[PDB]
């Protein structure tokens, strides 16, 4: 006879965005209506000494 | 629509003569009547051994 000793299944290494070093450079917000906005803008007012 | 987020005004930082290290090189005297005069003289008397 030939013997099949066993079948092994791989184990996945799950990851998330908020649990990684690159996330510190980021800052994450949920909005639910992003399709409706056209462009987001800042606005800076600066005075020079 | 077009979304405008928070607007920022410059957080201008203050600086002073006294707080600077250059003030140690200086002696600072305030004198409310300085406008009237234009002459300031000091005199040195030395005898050499």
UniProtKB/Swiss-Prot annotation, chains A, B:
Disulfide bonds: none annotated. It is found in: Virion; Host nucleus. Self-assembles to form an icosahedral capsid with a T=16 symmetry, about 200 nm in diameter, and consisting of 150 hexons and 12 pentons (total of 162 capsomers). Hexons form the edges and faces of the capsid and are each composed of six MCP molecules. In contrast, one penton is found at each of the 12 vertices. Eleven of the pentons are MCP pentamers, while the last vertex is occupied by the portal complex. Homomultimer. Makes the hexons and eleven out of twelve pentons. Interacts with triplex proteins 1/TRX1 and 2/TRX2; adjacent capsomers are linked together in groups of three by triplexes, heterotrimeric complexes composed of one molecule of TRX1 and two molecules of TRX2. Interacts with scaffold protein; this interaction allows efficient MCP transport to the host nucleus. Interacts with capsid vertex component 2/CVC2. Interacts with the small capsomere-interacting protein/SCP. Belongs to the herpesviridae major capsid protein family. This is Major capsid protein. The chain holds residues 50 to 98 of 1370 of the full protein.
